[PDB]
Amino acid sequence: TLMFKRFFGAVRTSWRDPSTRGAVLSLAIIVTAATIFYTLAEKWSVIDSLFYAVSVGLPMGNGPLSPTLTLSKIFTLVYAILVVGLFVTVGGSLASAIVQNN
Amino acid sequence: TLMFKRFFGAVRTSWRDPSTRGAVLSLAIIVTAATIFYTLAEKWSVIDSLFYAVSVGLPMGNGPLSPTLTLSKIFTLVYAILVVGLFVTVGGSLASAIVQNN
Amino acid sequence: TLMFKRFFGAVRTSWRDPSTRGAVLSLAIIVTAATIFYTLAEKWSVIDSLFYAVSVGLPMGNGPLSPTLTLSKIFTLVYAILVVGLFVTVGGSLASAIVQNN
Amino acid sequence: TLMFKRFFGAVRTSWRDPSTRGAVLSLAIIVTAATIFYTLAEKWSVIDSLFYAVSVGLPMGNGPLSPTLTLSKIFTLVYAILVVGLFVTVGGSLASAIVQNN
Ligand SMILES: [Ca+2]
Ligand SMILES: [Ca+2]
Ligand SMILES: [Ca+2]
Ligand SMILES: [Ca+2]
Ligand SMILES: [Ca+2]
Ligand SMILES: [Ca+2]
């Protein structure tokens, strides 16, 4: 039942490009690295990993998932300051691209 | 006595319009879209279903509520990336409207 | 040992005023209401209520507490969208006023 | 394997300076003061104390950790309103900083 959101969401507003949404490319790399780490550091599954990853840069909210080891705890601190930005502008450009599509 | 909030709130300052507080229009569809999905997929009640939908763009804070199923995990990201921007500009406009309302 | 911050921060940086930090008045007024509701509606203590109030618009996070009544659940939903923008601007003005203090 | 994030990230683009990244200074002093407080009041390990201290500026989400004493609740409100804007402006400057590196 998500077909409306996936196709008319974070695939629709992608096909709308200036140069400083090279930030969605930067997000991709910090989010995927983060996902790669959380799977391996924290033992979690991919989806749970990508969930927690995105959860530290948006208001969204980690479920049960949160770090348990010093390594991932510190990593989350370092990553948390880097991704906070990339999300913010991707949310903004993505948001206007909704209203420009109406 | 939630009245003075809902009435001197979402109703009162929600009627200060440019062309671009048609964001509220874009929002209402996206919160609604999410609420239908959460009710049906996650099986939650409408209010709790809405509670989670409004949670993923705002610092409000999701309850015990988090997605338990893969679709509800996946969908929560795609929705969460788009709405977070929609939530903000609307939240700014209303806040802007409270200050010039005294 | 917080006597340092309360004087050095919370009551430091407010003693600096433009036109727009009329926004503190409105934020002040929104939070007092919200707290009163929770103590009265949701039975919690003044701080636990006052903490949840501040939890919803800033990212800090509520620990244990989450509203349990359908009534208080909506109250937070409505109250959430109003207060967030006031949080932004008082939080932003106040932070710049630290940097102009170094 | 966080080395790739730590060196390629929260120091590699941390050292990209205008006048207005004097906030990173102000962040370091306030983030430190909090961590000291949280270590002392809340009994927590320094790491966890730093994990909560950052959790409240950023979208991260504290773990199962949260202020359980009244002082530490009283403290967190005052500190969250001060430190949130600093996390914000640094998050952008750091964000602009990854994109300027392409
Ligand atoms: Ca949050
Ligand atoms: Ca989160
Ligand atoms: Ca949370
Ligand atoms: Ca939230
Ligand atoms: Ca919060
Ligand atoms: Ca947070």
Side-chain angles (χ1 to χ4, degrees):
Chain A
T1 153
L2 85 114
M3 193 76 160
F4 154 93
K5 217 147 210 96
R6 235 289 277 123
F7 269 91
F8 261 21
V11 156
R12 181 207 37 158
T13 49
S14 301
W15 305 49
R16 270 210 44 118
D17 286 8
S19 49
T20 46
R21 299 173 202 179
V24 212
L25 289 323
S26 328
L27 191 64
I29 218 56
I30 310 203
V31 139
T32 307
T35 315
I36 299 153
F37 173 80
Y38 294 140
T39 313
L40 267 50
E42 271 297 328
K43 312 153 211 158
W44 301 317
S45 72
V46 198
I47 319 86
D48 284 275
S49 277
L50 165 67
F51 198 85
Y52 189 55
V54 170
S55 89
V56 308
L58 296 179
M60 193 171 91
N62 51 303
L65 323 155
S66 195
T68 47
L69 305 9
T70 317
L71 208 91
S72 61
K73 286 164 182 161
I74 68 112
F75 173 95
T76 294
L77 305 170
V78 168
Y79 168 42
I81 213 98
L82 293 180
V83 87
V84 61
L86 315 172
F87 266 120
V88 157
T89 54
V90 195
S93 344
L94 249 54
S96 299
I98 255 162
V99 152
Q100 295 191 109
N101 274 23
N102 295 149
Chain B
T1 210
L2 96 96
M3 309 295 287
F4 60 85
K5 206 112 338 307
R6 218 245 53 164
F7 286 122
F8 256 31
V11 156
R12 178 267 258 100
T13 58
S14 185
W15 274 124
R16 231 97 327 184
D17 306 30
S19 49
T20 48
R21 293 175 206 182
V24 202
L25 279 319
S26 317
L27 181 73
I29 171 172
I30 317 300
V31 196
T32 311
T35 313
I36 307 318
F37 184 81
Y38 291 132
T39 303
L40 264 24
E42 272 296 4
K43 20 208 161 96
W44 303 334
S45 13
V46 173
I47 328 80
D48 287 323
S49 265
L50 188 80
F51 210 86
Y52 197 81
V54 176
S55 88
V56 319
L58 239 146
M60 197 180 52
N62 66 305
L65 307 170
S66 206
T68 39
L69 311 348
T70 298
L71 263 74
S72 37
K73 301 189 191 254
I74 291 181
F75 163 112
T76 310
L77 328 170
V78 246
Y79 157 52
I81 200 48
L82 298 167
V83 79
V84 52
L86 289 180
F87 259 122
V88 158
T89 71
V90 195
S93 311
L94 288 100
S96 223
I98 318 270
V99 276
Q100 75 196 348
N101 267 5
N102 33 256
Chain C
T1 166
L2 72 345
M3 179 70 175
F4 138 67
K5 225 164 217 94
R6 178 64 183 165
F7 279 72
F8 213 66
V11 202
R12 175 196 49 161
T13 329
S14 315
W15 296 22
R16 247 254 42 202
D17 289 37
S19 54
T20 70
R21 299 176 204 166
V24 193
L25 286 308
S26 343
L27 189 72
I29 219 64
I30 279 199
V31 172
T32 315
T35 322
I36 288 183
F37 188 78
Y38 295 129
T39 321
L40 258 14
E42 268 279 36
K43 46 174 173 207
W44 311 337
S45 25
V46 182
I47 321 132
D48 273 311
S49 316
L50 195 98
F51 188 120
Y52 192 77
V54 179
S55 85
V56 306
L58 297 166
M60 79 157 172
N62 48 317
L65 317 157
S66 221
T68 45
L69 295 331
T70 299
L71 196 90
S72 65
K73 288 191 186 107
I74 81 146
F75 182 82
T76 302
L77 289 162
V78 179
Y79 165 68
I81 203 70
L82 290 204
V83 68
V84 48
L86 311 183
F87 265 151
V88 173
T89 72
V90 181
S93 289
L94 221 54
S96 183
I98 315 181
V99 195
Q100 301 171 353
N101 282 354
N102 295 145
Chain D
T1 179
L2 71 105
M3 275 290 261
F4 319 138
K5 185 78 55 278
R6 231 318 287 156
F7 268 96
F8 210 58
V11 92
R12 148 276 180 117
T13 34
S14 189
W15 219 260
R16 218 107 293 97
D17 310 355
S19 62
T20 37
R21 281 223 269 190
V24 185
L25 271 316
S26 321
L27 194 110
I29 173 191
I30 312 299
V31 170
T32 295
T35 312
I36 308 286
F37 190 73
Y38 288 168
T39 298
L40 265 95
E42 272 305 345
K43 318 137 190 171
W44 294 336
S45 42
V46 176
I47 315 79
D48 280 311
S49 298
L50 197 102
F51 201 94
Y52 190 72
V54 195
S55 85
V56 309
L58 299 167
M60 207 158 78
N62 50 296
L65 316 119
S66 211
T68 49
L69 302 355
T70 289
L71 224 79
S72 66
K73 311 176 199 260
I74 298 178
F75 167 99
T76 305
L77 318 157
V78 182
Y79 152 69
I81 206 69
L82 277 209
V83 87
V84 61
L86 306 164
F87 273 93
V88 172
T89 65
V90 174
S93 322
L94 275 176
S96 286
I98 322 87
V99 282
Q100 290 187 116
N101 287 19
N102 333 275

Short mmCIF file of all heavy atoms in Angstrom, two decimals, chain C residues 27-56:
data_model
loop_
_atom_site.label_atom_id
_atom_site.label_comp_id
_atom_site.label_asym_id
_atom_site.label_seq_id
_atom_site.Cartn_x
_atom_site.Cartn_y
_atom_site.Cartn_z
N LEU C 27 6.36 31.48 23.47
CA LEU C 27 6.89 30.18 23.83
C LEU C 27 6.69 29.90 25.31
O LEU C 27 6.22 28.79 25.66
CB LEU C 27 8.35 30.03 23.43
CG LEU C 27 8.96 28.62 23.55
CD1 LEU C 27 8.45 27.64 22.49
CD2 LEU C 27 10.49 28.67 23.56
N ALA C 28 6.99 30.91 26.14
CA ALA C 28 6.73 30.87 27.59
C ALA C 28 5.26 30.47 27.87
O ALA C 28 4.96 29.49 28.62
CB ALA C 28 7.06 32.21 28.22
N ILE C 29 4.36 31.24 27.22
CA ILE C 29 2.91 31.03 27.35
C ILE C 29 2.38 29.67 26.85
O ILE C 29 1.55 29.04 27.53
CB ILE C 29 2.09 32.23 26.84
CG1 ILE C 29 0.88 32.46 27.76
CG2 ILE C 29 1.73 32.09 25.36
CD1 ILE C 29 1.26 32.85 29.18
N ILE C 30 2.91 29.19 25.71
CA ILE C 30 2.62 27.84 25.19
C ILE C 30 3.04 26.67 26.12
O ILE C 30 2.26 25.69 26.32
CB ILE C 30 3.20 27.69 23.76
CG1 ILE C 30 2.24 28.33 22.77
CG2 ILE C 30 3.36 26.22 23.41
CD1 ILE C 30 2.40 27.89 21.31
N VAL C 31 4.25 26.78 26.66
CA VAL C 31 4.77 25.76 27.56
C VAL C 31 3.99 25.67 28.91
O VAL C 31 3.68 24.56 29.38
CB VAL C 31 6.32 25.84 27.71
CG1 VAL C 31 6.86 24.91 28.81
CG2 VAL C 31 7.00 25.53 26.38
N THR C 32 3.63 26.82 29.49
CA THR C 32 2.88 26.88 30.77
C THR C 32 1.52 26.19 30.68
O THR C 32 1.13 25.41 31.57
CB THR C 32 2.60 28.34 31.20
OG1 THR C 32 3.79 29.13 31.04
CG2 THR C 32 2.09 28.43 32.62
N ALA C 33 0.81 26.53 29.60
CA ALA C 33 -0.43 25.85 29.26
C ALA C 33 -0.24 24.31 29.23
O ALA C 33 -0.90 23.54 30.00
CB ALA C 33 -0.96 26.37 27.94
N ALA C 34 0.71 23.89 28.37
CA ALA C 34 1.01 22.49 28.08
C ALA C 34 1.32 21.67 29.31
O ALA C 34 0.84 20.52 29.46
CB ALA C 34 2.19 22.46 27.18
N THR C 35 2.16 22.27 30.17
CA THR C 35 2.49 21.69 31.47
C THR C 35 1.22 21.52 32.34
O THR C 35 1.06 20.45 32.97
CB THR C 35 3.48 22.57 32.23
OG1 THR C 35 4.42 23.11 31.30
CG2 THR C 35 4.20 21.81 33.28
N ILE C 36 0.35 22.55 32.34
CA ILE C 36 -0.80 22.55 33.25
C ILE C 36 -1.72 21.41 32.85
O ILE C 36 -2.15 20.61 33.71
CB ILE C 36 -1.54 23.90 33.33
CG1 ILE C 36 -0.70 24.92 34.10
CG2 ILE C 36 -2.85 23.71 34.06
CD1 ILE C 36 -1.32 26.28 34.33
N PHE C 37 -1.95 21.32 31.54
CA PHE C 37 -2.69 20.20 30.95
C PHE C 37 -2.20 18.82 31.42
O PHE C 37 -2.98 18.04 31.91
CB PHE C 37 -2.63 20.24 29.42
CG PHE C 37 -3.52 19.22 28.76
CD1 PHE C 37 -4.89 19.45 28.68
CD2 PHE C 37 -2.99 18.04 28.24
CE1 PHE C 37 -5.73 18.52 28.07
CE2 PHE C 37 -3.82 17.10 27.64
CZ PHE C 37 -5.19 17.34 27.55
N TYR C 38 -0.90 18.58 31.29
CA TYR C 38 -0.32 17.29 31.63
C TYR C 38 -0.37 16.93 33.11
O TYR C 38 -0.63 15.77 33.49
CB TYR C 38 1.10 17.20 31.13
CG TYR C 38 1.20 17.23 29.63
CD1 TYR C 38 2.07 18.14 29.00
CD2 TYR C 38 0.46 16.32 28.85
CE1 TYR C 38 2.16 18.19 27.64
CE2 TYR C 38 0.55 16.36 27.47
CZ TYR C 38 1.41 17.31 26.88
OH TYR C 38 1.55 17.42 25.52
N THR C 39 -0.11 17.91 33.97
CA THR C 39 -0.23 17.69 35.42
C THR C 39 -1.66 17.31 35.77
O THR C 39 -1.91 16.32 36.51
CB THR C 39 0.17 18.94 36.19
OG1 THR C 39 1.30 19.54 35.53
CG2 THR C 39 0.48 18.60 37.67
N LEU C 40 -2.59 18.09 35.16
CA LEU C 40 -4.02 17.94 35.38
C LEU C 40 -4.61 16.79 34.60
O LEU C 40 -5.28 15.95 35.17
CB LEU C 40 -4.72 19.27 35.12
CG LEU C 40 -5.17 20.16 36.29
CD1 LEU C 40 -4.58 19.83 37.66
CD2 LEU C 40 -4.93 21.63 35.95
N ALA C 41 -4.33 16.73 33.30
CA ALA C 41 -4.87 15.68 32.43
C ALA C 41 -4.20 14.36 32.70
O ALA C 41 -4.88 13.37 32.99
CB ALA C 41 -4.71 16.03 30.96
N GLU C 42 -2.86 14.37 32.62
CA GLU C 42 -2.08 13.17 32.61
C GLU C 42 -1.50 12.83 33.95
O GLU C 42 -0.67 11.93 34.01
CB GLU C 42 -0.96 13.29 31.55
CG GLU C 42 -1.33 12.77 30.18
CD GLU C 42 -1.21 11.26 30.07
OE1 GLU C 42 -1.52 10.56 31.05
OE2 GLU C 42 -0.85 10.79 28.97
N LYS C 43 -1.91 13.53 35.00
CA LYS C 43 -1.56 13.17 36.39
C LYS C 43 -0.07 13.33 36.86
O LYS C 43 0.22 13.28 38.07
CB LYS C 43 -2.13 11.75 36.79
CG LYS C 43 -1.91 10.60 35.78
CD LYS C 43 -2.34 9.18 36.23
CE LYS C 43 -2.25 8.15 35.09
NZ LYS C 43 -3.17 6.97 35.18
N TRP C 44 0.84 13.55 35.90
CA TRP C 44 2.29 13.70 36.15
C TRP C 44 2.61 14.93 37.02
O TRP C 44 1.76 15.78 37.25
CB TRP C 44 3.09 13.71 34.82
CG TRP C 44 2.74 12.56 33.87
CD1 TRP C 44 2.17 11.34 34.20
CD2 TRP C 44 2.98 12.51 32.46
NE1 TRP C 44 1.97 10.59 33.08
CE2 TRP C 44 2.47 11.25 32.00
CE3 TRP C 44 3.61 13.37 31.53
CZ2 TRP C 44 2.54 10.85 30.66
CZ3 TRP C 44 3.68 12.97 30.18
CH2 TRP C 44 3.15 11.71 29.76
N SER C 45 3.83 15.00 37.55
CA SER C 45 4.27 16.09 38.41
C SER C 45 4.69 17.29 37.55
O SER C 45 4.98 17.10 36.36
CB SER C 45 5.44 15.62 39.32
OG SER C 45 6.17 14.53 38.76
N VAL C 46 4.76 18.48 38.15
CA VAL C 46 5.09 19.75 37.45
C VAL C 46 6.33 19.64 36.51
O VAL C 46 6.28 20.09 35.37
CB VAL C 46 5.23 20.96 38.44
CG1 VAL C 46 5.52 22.30 37.72
CG2 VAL C 46 4.00 21.08 39.34
N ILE C 47 7.40 18.99 36.96
CA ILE C 47 8.61 18.88 36.15
C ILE C 47 8.41 17.88 35.04
O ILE C 47 8.64 18.24 33.90
CB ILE C 47 9.85 18.50 36.96
CG1 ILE C 47 9.84 19.22 38.31
CG2 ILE C 47 11.10 18.93 36.21
CD1 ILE C 47 10.11 18.34 39.51
N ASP C 48 7.99 16.65 35.40
CA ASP C 48 7.63 15.56 34.46
C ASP C 48 6.71 16.04 33.36
O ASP C 48 6.85 15.63 32.19
CB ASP C 48 6.91 14.42 35.20
CG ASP C 48 7.84 13.40 35.79
OD1 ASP C 48 8.75 12.93 35.07
OD2 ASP C 48 7.64 13.04 36.99
N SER C 49 5.74 16.88 33.74
CA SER C 49 4.90 17.56 32.79
C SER C 49 5.73 18.59 32.05
O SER C 49 5.65 18.63 30.82
CB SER C 49 3.71 18.22 33.49
OG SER C 49 3.14 17.34 34.43
N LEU C 50 6.54 19.39 32.77
CA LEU C 50 7.28 20.50 32.14
C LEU C 50 8.36 19.96 31.24
O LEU C 50 8.68 20.57 30.22
CB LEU C 50 7.90 21.49 33.16
CG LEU C 50 8.37 22.84 32.58
CD1 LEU C 50 7.30 23.88 32.81
CD2 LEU C 50 9.67 23.37 33.17
N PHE C 51 8.93 18.82 31.64
CA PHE C 51 9.87 18.11 30.80
C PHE C 51 9.18 17.63 29.51
O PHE C 51 9.67 17.90 28.44
CB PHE C 51 10.49 16.99 31.54
CG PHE C 51 11.61 16.31 30.81
CD1 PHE C 51 12.85 16.29 31.37
CD2 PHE C 51 11.41 15.58 29.61
CE1 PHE C 51 13.89 15.61 30.76
CE2 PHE C 51 12.44 14.92 28.97
CZ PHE C 51 13.68 14.91 29.57
N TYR C 52 8.07 16.90 29.60
CA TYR C 52 7.40 16.46 28.39
C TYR C 52 7.06 17.64 27.44
O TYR C 52 7.00 17.49 26.20
CB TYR C 52 6.14 15.64 28.69
CG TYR C 52 5.64 14.96 27.46
CD1 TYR C 52 6.28 13.81 26.98
CD2 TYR C 52 4.57 15.51 26.71
CE1 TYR C 52 5.85 13.17 25.82
CE2 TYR C 52 4.13 14.89 25.52
CZ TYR C 52 4.78 13.73 25.08
OH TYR C 52 4.39 13.12 23.93
N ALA C 53 6.81 18.80 28.02
CA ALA C 53 6.42 19.96 27.24
C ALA C 53 7.56 20.38 26.33
O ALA C 53 7.35 20.70 25.15
CB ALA C 53 6.00 21.09 28.16
N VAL C 54 8.76 20.32 26.90
CA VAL C 54 9.98 20.82 26.26
C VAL C 54 10.47 19.70 25.35
O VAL C 54 11.05 20.00 24.33
CB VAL C 54 11.04 21.26 27.30
CG1 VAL C 54 12.28 21.73 26.60
CG2 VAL C 54 10.55 22.41 28.15
N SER C 55 10.18 18.45 25.71
CA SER C 55 10.53 17.28 24.91
C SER C 55 9.93 17.30 23.52
O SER C 55 10.56 16.80 22.61
CB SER C 55 10.10 15.99 25.65
OG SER C 55 8.76 15.66 25.40
N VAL C 56 8.71 17.84 23.37
CA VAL C 56 7.97 17.74 22.08
C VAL C 56 8.40 18.67 20.97
O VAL C 56 8.13 18.38 19.79
CB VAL C 56 6.39 17.73 22.19
CG1 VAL C 56 5.97 16.63 23.15
CG2 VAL C 56 5.80 19.09 22.57
#
